[PDB]
């Protein structure tokens, strides 16, 4: 509920280039990413957080959807690249 | 219009499922014919013990799930299929009178088997 | 947000108040320490406590083992 | 047509499962020939204690999985499990108090009428 | 509504049971304390004093089975 | 509309009959006078066959799961 | 579903009913066994068919692959 | 029939071994009470008194026993 | 025992409907629909469903599907070049 | 069944005969593996719907065979469709 | 099917009477077997199916 | 049959009487709790009983370790 | 300097007996000079038992919580 | 020990060609397979042999040997089939 | 062998499992047997994916 | 025979006579049970018996963890 903000009209009157689309994909999943991170170890270094179980039972939940979303990022790229292989391999 | 009916439909079912119907009554039932509370005799040589009303009945439903019905001696049906183990009985000694929570049948129900149960009692004299 | 938050919030909003009464018995017990009645609330809010917390954090711990089944099978 | 059958039938059936149908009565039944209560004799040298009706069926009911029948010297309601018969004894009026199934209630009266019989007197000298 | 679990009942079944005995024994200390030699408030006391200590002990034992049992349930979801 | 494993926990549930109320009626009891030594013997065996009862449930529904999941594993 | 558009009960409604069930008083032991064994059937049947379907589209991979 | 389990079988082997003291126990009490003055009636009391305590102590000490053994095995199937 | 039935005489195939489904490669009505809700969706209901394992299971086929269907359009064009190639030198 | 044993009297085989054409000899073979390949693939499948099935030992080991047979079946017929094709191009393009 | 008839006789009987220590000490065993008899049939029909599929993975 | 059942046997064949041995003395025991040449032969059956048990299940898990830990090794 | 939670649940129990601390070893400063007072050891009798319990309660309700939060940490894997 | 016999005079023939040598080295690959995935199969269904370890440690070898031997002779004689295709295509 | 020695101090130990000499003995040799047997099916497991890996690498 | 029996070996021989001492006190003791010279001597001797059994069996056991442990990682 805190900061809350979506664009409209994303599409209606301007495309992007590919050439862009990729570059923006890429900034905007890589800096979440690493603030993501910064997080999870502020949250195991204040030793108020690691002693609390209202503390702890967050921040398990934290480190899952780290895991899970960087995991689910690497697959689908991976498998997004090799189906470019096999246009262009003769 | 057959989208629209159906995303509407389905979002108000959502929205209802919340709401809770059922409502809990609370009856007060003087009786005429009997104390209300449960009653030791110290004999001499015996201590004898009888309890009243409200004790046998807590007793008698204990646990029981199945709805009450027929006692001798479309949310309508979720409503009814109220259990029996809801219902409270508290005797209040100040009035001589019992307390009854339950649904507005299951009042009904108990009012008549008090009616059934509270019978004025015949004298003896030995000689 | 996430499912993995919805079932981790699906027992928050299960036990209303758990959460509260056990710090305020505790600071009851904390002012009177020897008094035993008491002492026999807090030893059940405890022990609810200990419980509720154990059953969520196992279940969240395998919803989390069926995605991540799931994401690898992607391949 | 066909598919609109089927699925109608089908949601109306569901719509239903939750409904339950079985249902619970009270019998009140006097005892005209003896006491309710368990009785107990106090004497010289001994102690005596005799169980009442209400002990003896519930001592022999306690647990039983199978519908009772034939008592001797949709109809999924009617397989109601002996086990949820209860029976309390009432002193206040001498009569007992008895929940469950109609026929139930009815086996039960038909032994209980069985057995309140009144007893012969005997004098010795 | 004040939300309590199963063991909470658990342990409310013993204070319903005991219908007034928590405040017997404060209302036969009192009487104690205001004639600590006569014999007949002594023999009270010793009675309803003994009873309490019972109630306390079998309630706190039950309530610690119960714990251990649930525990080593929720053990196995693992 | 069910498993296995739920056939595995019914064969122990319809096997003690009845004890899971047994137990609650004897706490019933209990509750109502503390200090009868019959019913604190009677309430101790109780109590402690319906312990021995979840375990012996709960470690065989484990067991059983393992060896499926080991099975399942080698369907690759 | 409330839905059918023309042209049982699964284990996936089973546990989040259980488990809907549970929440309301995690201590009470026939809830926590009711539940252990819900949430591993539905543990397993999760595994079985993500692996197979895993096995269809490797066969197909495959074909496609040897005719290149 | 009401289901028995092995621990409750084990209970009950003392309970119909020892006939009648539970009731012989209860009537000598009520002749103490009729007059605490009797020595025949108090040397009376003191060996079913001691009677019944030994006989509730083996009792829940093997149950106790056995329960041990029992956890012990079903600890391994794990 | 109960609901017990077999038939003796003929193979009569029941376990499926035979039906032109058989006489198909790729139900390319099915992908169609399904890449189409996968693309419409912008900015309504919400993103991120990397966790829930029923929607999870869901994704798994088609984004396996659309994979194959675009790995046999490449293997097909490659054939009929060839074939053109292989008459027009001979 | 499992009480019972049924044998065939003598098996003589009429489809032994040549008599149909190099192109029948195709089209039974084409039509046979068809059905036999889209009857297995559901059998599997239902086998997972199903709960009481999914979560017994007994029929998972089962399940087990079932899919690695359909497995080793259709990647035969494929590598030996490849290696008829394979001979008449070799040959033609010779 | 004799050791699959074998665990769930005993279980039943184990059901029946869950204290006693000579049908818990049967049922330890009983089960124990079955588990290892299971994983040992599986690994093996694994083992035989994947060498077929490599054979044709040779010349495939 | 199977190994871990001979295994598991050979104890009950060693201990000849031990399991009928204890019923007995628990049903002389039960017929006068107070005598002590009883009480002291109760208590050394028992204690004999308790110890078999232990050392007959040990026993059976450590070779049900040592089978999986081989046929892990199949694959 | 950094207060965890413990610490926290410790020093509730701490700031609950505010001065029997002390008064534990004033009443013991009274009675070992004059042992035979009967009001002294009245005093000391109850001062000292109340000050094991609160030392007993607090070591048991510190270990509950560090079990809690070991049990959770585990499932980080 | 029980109920035990063995051959002890093997039949005999003439080798005279390269034919009668591949028949007869073939044959004799085929029948000792055969025995070897037999003889397994029974040792995993044997109870006595399933879960004495002792009997576990050597039919681990055994499905070895299998193994390996299988592997073998499907790796030299691909090899000795692509050796012919390569020179006859050159 | 060690597979005979194991048996054999079973068989005293079930004759008495109350003599403390004898359990002690028996822990140990059970200990040393269950070290033995792993580190034998390792071994030969080890030896056996070598051997396979060539072959891969050749196929 | 390995080396853990090496190790158990060095309890047997680092007490000489303690087995046999224990034998031979205990029937001393069963002879004339109520003498506190024999009650003085026998209670000391018992306890140094059941500290050596504890401590060569903890022993043995650490051993057998850290060599399983080792084994392992062959793999
Ligand atoms: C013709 C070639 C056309 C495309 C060429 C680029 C190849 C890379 C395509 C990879 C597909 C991306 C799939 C990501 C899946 C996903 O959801 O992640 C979104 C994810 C987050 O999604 P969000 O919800 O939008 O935030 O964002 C990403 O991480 C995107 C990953 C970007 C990495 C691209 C790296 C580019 C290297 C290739 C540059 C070489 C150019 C040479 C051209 C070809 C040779 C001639
Ligand atoms: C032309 C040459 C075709 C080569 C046939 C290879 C036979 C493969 C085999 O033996 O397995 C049979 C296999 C199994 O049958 P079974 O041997 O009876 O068990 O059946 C098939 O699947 C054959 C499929 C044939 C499809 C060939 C494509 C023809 C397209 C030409 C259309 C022209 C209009």
Redesign the interface.
Known sequence: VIGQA???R??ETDIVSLDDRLLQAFSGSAIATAVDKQTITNRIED??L?????E??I???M???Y???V??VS??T??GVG?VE??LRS | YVDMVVNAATMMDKQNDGIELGRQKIGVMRLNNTFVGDRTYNLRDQKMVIPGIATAIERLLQGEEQPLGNIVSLQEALKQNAAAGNIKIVAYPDTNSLLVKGTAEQVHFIEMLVKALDVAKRHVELS | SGYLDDVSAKFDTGVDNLQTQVTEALDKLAAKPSDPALLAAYQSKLSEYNLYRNAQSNTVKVFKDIDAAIIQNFR
């Open positions: 979506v664009n409209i994303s599409m030793p108020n690691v002693t609390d179980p209202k702890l039972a921040s398990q939940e480190i899952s959807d895991n899970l979303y995991s689910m697959t689908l991976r498998k189906a096999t246009l």
